[PDB]
Design an enzyme around this catalytic site. Sequence first.
Site, short mmCIF file in Angstrom:
data_model
loop_
_atom_site.label_atom_id
_atom_site.label_comp_id
_atom_site.label_asym_id
_atom_site.label_seq_id
_atom_site.Cartn_x
_atom_site.Cartn_y
_atom_site.Cartn_z
N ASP A 89 -5.76 8.21 -1.97
CA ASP A 89 -6.44 8.60 -0.73
C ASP A 89 -7.27 9.80 -1.11
OD1 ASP A 89 -5.53 6.74 1.14
OD2 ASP A 89 -3.68 7.87 1.52
N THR A 90 -8.59 9.66 -1.06
CA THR A 90 -9.46 10.77 -1.40
C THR A 90 -10.08 11.32 -0.12
OG1 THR A 90 -11.35 9.27 -1.65
CG2 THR A 90 -10.09 9.77 -3.62
N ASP B 84 -13.01 6.70 -2.91
CA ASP B 84 -12.11 5.56 -2.96
C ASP B 84 -12.71 4.16 -3.00
OD1 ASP B 84 -11.22 5.85 0.60
OD2 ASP B 84 -13.03 5.14 -0.39
N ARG C 31 -12.25 -5.89 1.12
CA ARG C 31 -12.37 -5.17 -0.14
C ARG C 31 -11.28 -5.57 -1.17
NH1 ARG C 31 -12.61 0.89 2.14
NH2 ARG C 31 -10.59 0.17 2.98
N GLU D 67 -12.75 11.97 2.55
CA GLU D 67 -13.95 11.17 2.80
C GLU D 67 -15.18 12.01 3.01
OE1 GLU D 67 -11.64 8.29 3.64
OE2 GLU D 67 -12.92 6.95 4.82
N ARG E 125 -11.64 -1.22 -3.31
CA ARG E 125 -10.96 -0.04 -2.79
C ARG E 125 -9.89 0.32 -3.85
NH1 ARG E 125 -8.20 3.93 -1.51
NH2 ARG E 125 -7.67 4.54 0.64
#
Length: 130
Positions: free
Chosen positions: A34-35, A15, A76, A37, A29
């Site tokens: 939502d990947t 992400d 970000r 982590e 970002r």
Amino acid sequence: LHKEPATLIKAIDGDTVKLMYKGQPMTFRLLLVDTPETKVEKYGPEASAFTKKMYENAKKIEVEFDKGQRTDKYGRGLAYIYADGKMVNEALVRQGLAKVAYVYKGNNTHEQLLRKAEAQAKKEKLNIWS
């Protein structure tokens, strides 16, 4: 919305990516995704490898800010990133390597587009949807 050029500095993970944007280094970002982590969740290394490959092999990288807030609390940039005309946000969701995240401060222009890609990945039981 309009696309602006950027240059890859460093892929960080699924992400997040560091890019040179309008002359200075900036951490971005990816909006609406939502990947898993690596900093290591399941599919986290696959998602980060997937985006790393897209960023490194591209001739052109472009960033597109949405109409809402453009930076999060950690400084970000919040955007849709394109590698050779292909939206990375979308590609991750479609490949089933990310879920669509909740809309953040008005940044919802491509939410429908991503919602549809995710439903399809779900139908195909791809990766995260295995």
